[PDB]
Amino acid sequence: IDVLLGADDGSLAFVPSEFSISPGEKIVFKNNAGFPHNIVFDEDSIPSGVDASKISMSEEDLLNAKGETFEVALSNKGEYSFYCSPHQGAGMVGKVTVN
Ligand SMILES: [Hg+2]
């Protein structure tokens, strides 16, 4: 599935921000507008036993240019909350369900 980082009008959102995938499906996060952007999974809000470090950028890593991508595949079933660290407060958050 392709997820835009920043809407085409510059709003600080993941597009889409809520979505479902099957195990092993790759999410391609695409730097679009309003950067810098990153993707960080909340360790307290992902399935038990999942290593956040495997599926997240570092809070310190940033995508600074249009078209940079971050790709990840999830396999454990359940709900995954994620956010962009620099824009968390602006509401740039999302949740993926693996079902
Ligand atoms: Hg962001």
GROMACS .gro file of C-alpha atoms and ligand atoms in nm:
model
  100
    1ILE     CA    1   0.000   0.000   0.000
    2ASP     CA    2   0.127   0.353  -0.070
    3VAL     CA    3   0.097   0.614   0.205
    4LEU     CA    4   0.164   0.982   0.138
    5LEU     CA    5   0.368   1.178   0.394
    6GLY     CA    6   0.195   1.515   0.372
    7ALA     CA    7  -0.119   1.582   0.164
    8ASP     CA    8  -0.101   1.755  -0.175
    9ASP     CA    9  -0.231   2.079  -0.013
   10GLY     CA   10   0.054   2.070   0.236
   11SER     CA   11  -0.146   1.936   0.534
   12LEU     CA   12   0.057   1.738   0.787
   13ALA     CA   13  -0.118   1.403   0.755
   14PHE     CA   14  -0.053   1.048   0.645
   15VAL     CA   15  -0.275   0.973   0.341
   16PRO     CA   16  -0.438   0.736   0.422
   17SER     CA   17  -0.391   0.750   0.799
   18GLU     CA   18  -0.601   0.445   0.890
   19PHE     CA   19  -0.579   0.126   0.689
   20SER     CA   20  -0.560  -0.253   0.695
   21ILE     CA   21  -0.314  -0.492   0.526
   22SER     CA   22  -0.249  -0.868   0.527
   23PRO     CA   23   0.064  -1.011   0.686
   24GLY     CA   24   0.378  -0.952   0.485
   25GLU     CA   25   0.230  -0.673   0.269
   26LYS     CA   26   0.477  -0.385   0.224
   27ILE     CA   27   0.383  -0.029   0.324
   28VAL     CA   28   0.564   0.232   0.115
   29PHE     CA   29   0.571   0.565   0.297
   30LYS     CA   30   0.637   0.833   0.034
   31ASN     CA   31   0.771   1.180   0.119
   32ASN     CA   32   0.515   1.412  -0.043
   33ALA     CA   33   0.468   1.761   0.105
   34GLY     CA   34   0.535   1.949   0.430
   35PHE     CA   35   0.855   1.771   0.530
   36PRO     CA   36   1.058   1.673   0.715
   37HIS     CA   37   0.873   1.354   0.797
   38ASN     CA   38   0.950   1.022   0.969
   39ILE     CA   39   0.752   0.716   1.073
   40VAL     CA   40   0.782   0.593   1.434
   41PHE     CA   41   0.584   0.302   1.579
   42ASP     CA   42   0.471   0.344   1.939
   43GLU     CA   43   0.615   0.050   2.133
   44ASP     CA   44   0.330   0.068   2.380
   45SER     CA   45   0.078   0.055   2.095
   46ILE     CA   46   0.188  -0.236   1.871
   47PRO     CA   47   0.124  -0.610   1.916
   48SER     CA   48   0.297  -0.772   2.216
   49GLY     CA   49   0.640  -0.913   2.136
   50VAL     CA   50   0.701  -0.700   1.826
   51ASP     CA   51   1.034  -0.511   1.824
   52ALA     CA   52   0.949  -0.147   1.731
   53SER     CA   53   1.313  -0.099   1.630
   54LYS     CA   54   1.266  -0.337   1.336
   55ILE     CA   55   0.973  -0.150   1.183
   56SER     CA   56   1.042   0.215   1.275
   57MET     CA   57   1.281   0.492   1.173
   58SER     CA   58   1.480   0.645   1.456
   59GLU     CA   59   1.306   0.946   1.609
   60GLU     CA   60   1.618   1.125   1.488
   61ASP     CA   61   1.610   1.004   1.126
   62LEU     CA   62   1.423   1.226   0.879
   63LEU     CA   63   1.307   1.213   0.516
   64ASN     CA   64   1.399   1.565   0.391
   65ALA     CA   65   1.332   1.551   0.017
   66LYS     CA   66   1.035   1.485  -0.205
   67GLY     CA   67   1.014   1.121  -0.309
   68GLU     CA   68   1.233   0.966  -0.038
   69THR     CA   69   1.053   0.654   0.087
   70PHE     CA   70   1.049   0.435   0.397
   71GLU     CA   71   0.924   0.080   0.335
   72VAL     CA   72   0.817  -0.175   0.596
   73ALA     CA   73   0.634  -0.508   0.597
   74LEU     CA   74   0.440  -0.616   0.906
   75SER     CA   75   0.360  -0.977   0.990
   76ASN     CA   76   0.214  -1.005   1.343
   77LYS     CA   77  -0.163  -0.952   1.348
   78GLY     CA   78  -0.311  -0.665   1.543
   79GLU     CA   79  -0.317  -0.287   1.560
   80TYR     CA   80  -0.015  -0.069   1.510
   81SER     CA   81  -0.026   0.304   1.602
   82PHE     CA   82   0.243   0.524   1.443
   83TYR     CA   83   0.333   0.889   1.424
   84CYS     CA   84   0.572   1.139   1.276
   85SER     CA   85   0.789   1.269   1.565
   86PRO     CA   86   0.830   1.634   1.459
   87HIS     CA   87   0.459   1.667   1.373
   88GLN     CA   88   0.307   1.444   1.638
   89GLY     CA   89   0.148   1.743   1.812
   90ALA     CA   90   0.009   1.874   1.483
   91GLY     CA   91  -0.182   1.543   1.461
   92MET     CA   92   0.036   1.358   1.206
   93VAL     CA   93  -0.050   1.013   1.345
   94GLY     CA   94  -0.199   0.697   1.196
   95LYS     CA   95  -0.287   0.337   1.276
   96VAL     CA   96  -0.253   0.023   1.064
   97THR     CA   97  -0.434  -0.303   1.131
   98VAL     CA   98  -0.277  -0.630   1.017
   99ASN     CA   99  -0.568  -0.874   0.983
  100HG      HG  100   0.577   1.487   0.963
   0.00000   0.00000   0.00000
